[PDB]
Design a protein around this ligand. Structure first.
Ligand SMILES: [Mg+2]
Ligand SMILES: [Mg+2]
Ligand SMILES: [Mg+2]
Ligand SMILES: [Mg+2]
Ligand SMILES: [Mg+2]
Ligand SMILES: [Mg+2]
Ligand SMILES: [Mg+2]
Ligand SMILES: [Mg+2]
Ligand SMILES: [Mg+2]
Ligand SMILES: [Mg+2]
Ligand SMILES: [Mg+2]
Ligand SMILES: [Mg+2]
Ligand SMILES: [Mg+2]
Ligand SMILES: [Mg+2]
Ligand SMILES: [Mg+2]
Ligand SMILES: [Mg+2]
Ligand SMILES: [Mg+2]
Ligand SMILES: [Mg+2]
Ligand SMILES: [Mg+2]
Ligand SMILES: [Zn+2]
Lengths: 137, 99, 97, 49, 122, 86, 116, 116
RNA sequence: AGAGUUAAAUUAUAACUAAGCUGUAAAAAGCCCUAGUUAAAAUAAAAUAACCCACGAAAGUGACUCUAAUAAUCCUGACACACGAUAGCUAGGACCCAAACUGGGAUUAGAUACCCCACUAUGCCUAGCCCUAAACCCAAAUAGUUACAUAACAAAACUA
């Protein structure tokens, strides 16, 4: 059972299949986990949005959507909407650091989606645009 | 009358030179439940652990073989004028007077 | 009059100084395979001295070569090339535990 | 010695007459500078594959 | 070798690569420089998608051009190569062989710094 | 953006294990220093504060390394005292 | 202003035998055409010392130091004619001029004919 | 390894600009810091979620699903046992590391020498 | 000091999906020409390497390449000469982003403050000024010593 955590880059001749599809055809689930909200959008390999569900759309409120349960419910709703269109495996791409980071990821599993790979795509500027000033002057 | 320099030049420690990876013969003078105080004879006494093989054969006065690592463990730290002597030596157990 | 007195001579037991892995070597900006061994496969960070173990010159030379290659178009910045991913491990950093 | 060393290299330089031959020779003779290292300090090359 | 040119040409056919190399070397010789050798590094996948000449390039051929040129024509060669549509990214640097490999002496043991504070009793 | 996707910071789960895959990815990020950098870049820090933070971190790291080295050196003397009652 | 030929066959490859027997490529590579500004500075210093000084071997002499600093002063003026906003090189040129003036005063106080 | 300290502080013999500015003098103390209390985290959250799933799906009745009710109690009992026994076991032994009470006494045996 | 280049992020700009996005301890205001994904110039800045301590007289400098180049056969020495962070002024250009000020939203008895949103001068480039800092490492420059000797703290005491 030689298993490597590195992704199966299409340039190689690897033979790994999930539900009969290759790694390049498996849909993507972008989870933007902000400090006040968590937006989950399920798109296909052709970059076609299939399921979209966020904490704000889940009937929450200003401070109600900042908790991890909001991310879990948004993930459950996104998983239900994606399974309504007939998907089994999905690749989770996490964007940003927030309280609802792992809760949103586990929400898909709770709602009935299998996670095969987790990719951390967090915007890291190489000292680009100047961010806002520090709080608590 | 033999001189101190003359006897030091012929001392076994002078012939040994560096204390790195040198085979020496020591004699155990104190016994603990799991630790053995072996006096290799240079300056201090090293502390070793009783091995699983022939553990009962290690008694007080038993002679053993050692591979000496350091003659005296001293090191410097932050704000320390002098070194921190461990009052011991670093050595490992190989056998018990194989003859 | 004593012939057994110590003589002020050099130390005969002086051990050779430890060398960096690239000691007396040539570092280049075109050997992407060599340059990738010092970068993280997942993030692409350049490992420091405590991870690599290089003496004072080669660490800076490797850093400069990596920075030059990342901009000249020879080595990716965001990740390590999967072609060179199967290279022998020279760093002393372990991620998976 | 430097002048003599450069004299030998002057024969292999690229000129107007040798431009066409050198272009074709380069287009058919690839070169690689990739070589890795080990913990012992020995060089390894992928050309043995 | 004095200067080194890392020529990233657009991935094209064999005759077009030959013509591009011929004209690039002719332009380099016209500026007063003699080309020492021409080394081809092969056609590899580009590390990143390079945008040049209003074209998105995913592949490219690498070439190594070592030559001797005066210090005044480096900018003229750079400007000439900047406007070439068949060049993805031209770069002129100093050849690595002109810098002698000095003696990498090794890891000299640096002792712990002392006498940074007074002997006052705490 | 210009680089190929699903290559950097990508962890493949094994046997459907997601909780441990997330922990492995977080350990990757912490050891690469991405978590601290992201938390620091949320609000801009002035160079005067950056120099103070760097100096404080360097001093703390040196002190911790020296304390750990001394603890490891003195670990030998943790054995039971054979000369009790002397 | 001095006009060093681009084909001067600079000093590092000038006193060795067999320089004129090789083909044109070797001479062109070993000449000032492919050289940097430091080689031209060395050539100018050698040419100025061979004509102004009386003992080219006496480098520690005040006149030799004055000639060496004059070469650097001319180079700094040439650099300044191109770079107007460069302040470090302007400071270098001004302090080199001050040092040359101090050495000229010392030479005038010590040996008047050499100073003149 | 330990980062270098030469040329870091501001001293009379140091010619360069100081690199490190110590908040307090870098003297190795004779006692280590006491282990900061590891704030306890909520347990059996996953078990409670699947327990409340039965209530949400079956309109809040325990007669529909029973295993999701019994496993929640088992998790609560295991968490209580872990809170009780480990709070003593970890304070008694820390495997590789030593307790701070033993570390302080060990350091007092071989303290630092700032003076003399 | 000049010339050339951009790896990440961000944005003007188009396409699919949703009614929400941002915002805090909690809210409100603001934006719903909004948000998520796929592509995308210009401007600004230059993650890790840096646990490195180098260059420069100082201020200051660490994305890359090329050119010029870093005084003194080396004492101290001005009111003379030349520089001199950020902030500010003038003329032109640029403006993603941040933000004085200002206008709204919270808390406050009051809040013309600390919390949130929008925006200006400004931070950017060229040329010309202003010549100020906790310009501090509060320890002057040049060649030295570990002799006598702890007001206190702090970076030990001192010579010509
Ligand atoms: Mg203030
Ligand atoms: Mg300096
Ligand atoms: Mg203080
Ligand atoms: Mg300019
Ligand atoms: Mg970009
Ligand atoms: Mg615009
Ligand atoms: Mg509102
Ligand atoms: Mg950078
Ligand atoms: Mg100098
Ligand atoms: Mg002076
Ligand atoms: Mg203006
Ligand atoms: Mg703002
Ligand atoms: Mg107001
Ligand atoms: Mg503005
Ligand atoms: Mg300004
Ligand atoms: Mg100013
Ligand atoms: Mg300052
Ligand atoms: Mg003052
Ligand atoms: Mg003075
Ligand atoms: Zn080395």
């Amino acid at each position: 059972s030689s298993f490597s955590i590195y992704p199966p880059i299409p340039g190689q001749e690897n033979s790994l299949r999930w539900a009969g599809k290759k790694f390049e055809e498996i849909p993507i689930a972008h989870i933007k986990a902000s400090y006040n909200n968590t937006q989950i959008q399920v798109v296909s390999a052709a970059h076609q949005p299939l399921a979209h569900a966020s904490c704000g759309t889940e009937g929450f409120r200003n401070a109600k959507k900042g908790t991890g349960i909001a991310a879990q419910t948004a993930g459950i709703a996104a998983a239900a909407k994606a399974t309504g269109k007939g998907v089994t495996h999905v690749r989770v791409v996490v964007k940003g650091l927030g309280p609802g980071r792992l809760s949103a990821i586990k929400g898909l599993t709770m709602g009935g989606l299998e996670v095969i790979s987790i990719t951390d795509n967090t915007p890291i500027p190489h000292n680009g645009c100047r961010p806002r000033k520090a709080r608590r002057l | 009358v033999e001189s101190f320099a003359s006897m030091l030049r012929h001392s076994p420690l002078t012939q040994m030179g560096p204390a790195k990876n040198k085979l020496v013969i020591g004699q155990i003078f104190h016994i603990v439940e799991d630790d053995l105080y072996i006096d290799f004879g240079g300056k201090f006494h090293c502390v070793c652990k009783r091995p699983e093989v022939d553990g009962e054969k290690y008694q007080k006065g038993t002679r053993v073989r050692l591979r000496l690592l350091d003659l005296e463990l001293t090191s410097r730290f932050l704000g320390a004028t002098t070194d921190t002597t461990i009052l011991e030596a670093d050595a490992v157990l190989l056998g018990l007077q194989e003859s | 009059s004593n012939e057994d007195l110590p003589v002020p001579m050099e130390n005969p037991y002086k051990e050779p100084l430890k060398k960096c892995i690239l000691c007396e070597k040539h570092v280049d900006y075109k050997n992407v395979q060599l340059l990738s061994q010092f970068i993280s496969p997942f993030t692409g960070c350049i490992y420091g001295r405590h991870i690599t173990g290089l003496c004072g010159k080669k660490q800076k030379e490797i850093t400069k070569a990596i920075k030059r290659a990342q901009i000249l178009g020879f080595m990716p910045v965001t990740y390590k090339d999967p072609a060179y991913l199967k290279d022998p491990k020279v760093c002393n950093i372990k991620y998976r535990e | 010695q430097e002048v003599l060393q450069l004299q030998e290299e002057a024969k292999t330089f690229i000129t107007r007459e040798n431009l066409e031959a050198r272009v074709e020779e380069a287009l058919d003779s690839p070169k690689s500078y990739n070589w890795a290292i080990t913990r012992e300090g020995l060089v390894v090359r992928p050309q043995q594959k | 070798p004095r200067y080194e040119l890392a020529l990233i040409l657009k991935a094209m056919q064999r005759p077009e690569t030959a013509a591009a190399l011929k004209r690039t070397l002719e332009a380099l010789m016209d500026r007063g420089a003699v080309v020492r050798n021409l080394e081809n590094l092969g056609e590899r996948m580009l590390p990143y998608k390079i945008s040049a000449h209003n074209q998105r390039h995913s592949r490219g051929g690498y070439f190594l051009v070592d030559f001797y040129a005066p210090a005044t024509t480096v900018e003229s060669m750079m400007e000439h190569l900047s406007r070439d549509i068949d060049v993805i990214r031209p770069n002129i640097v100093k050849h690595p062989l002109t810098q002698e490999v000095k003696e990498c002496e090794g890891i000299v043991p640096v002792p712990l710094e002392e006498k940074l504070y007074s002997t006052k009793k705490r | 953006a210009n680089h190929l996707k699903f290559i950097a910071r990508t962890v493949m789960v094994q046997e459907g294990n997601v909780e441990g895959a997330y922990r492995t990815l977080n350990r990757i990020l912490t050891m690469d220093g991405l978590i601290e950098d992201i938390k620091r870049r949320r609000y801009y820090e002035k160079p005067c504060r950056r120099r103070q933070r760097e100096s404080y971190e360097t001093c703390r790291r040196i002190y911790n390394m020296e304390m750990a080295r001394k603890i490891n050196f003195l670990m030998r003397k943790n054995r039971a005292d054979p000369w009790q009652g002397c | 202003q001095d006009d060093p030929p681009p084909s001067m066959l600079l000093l590092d490859y000038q006193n060795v035998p067999g320089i004129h027997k090789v083909d044109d490529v070797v001479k062109r590579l070993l000449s000032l055409e492919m050289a940097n500004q430091k080689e031209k500075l060395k050539i100018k210093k050698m040419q100025l010392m061979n004509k102004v000084l009386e003992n080219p071997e006496d480098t520690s002499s005040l006149e030799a130091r004055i000639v060496a600093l004059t070469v650097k002063i001319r180079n700094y003026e040439e650099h300044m004619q191109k770079h107007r906003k460069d302040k470090a090189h302007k400071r270098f040129l001004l302090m080199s001029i001050d040092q040359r003036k101090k050495m000229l005063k010392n030479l005038r106080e010590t040996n008047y004919a050499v100073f003149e | 390894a330990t980062p270098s300290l030469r040329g870091r502080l501001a001293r009379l013999g140091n010619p360069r600009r100081p690199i490190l500015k110590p908040n307090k003098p870098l003297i190795l103390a004779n006692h280590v810091g006491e282990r900061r209390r590891e704030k306890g985290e909520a347990t059996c959250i996953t078990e409670m979620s699947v327990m409340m799933a039965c209530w949400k799906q079956n309109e809040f009745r325990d007669e529909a699903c029973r295993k999701e009710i019994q496993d929640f109690f088992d998790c609560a009992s295991r968490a209580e046992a872990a809170r009780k026994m480990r709070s003593i076991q970890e304070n008694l032994g820390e495997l590789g590391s030593l307790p701070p009470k033993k570390l302080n006494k060990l350091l007092h045996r071989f303290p630092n020498k700032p003076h003399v």
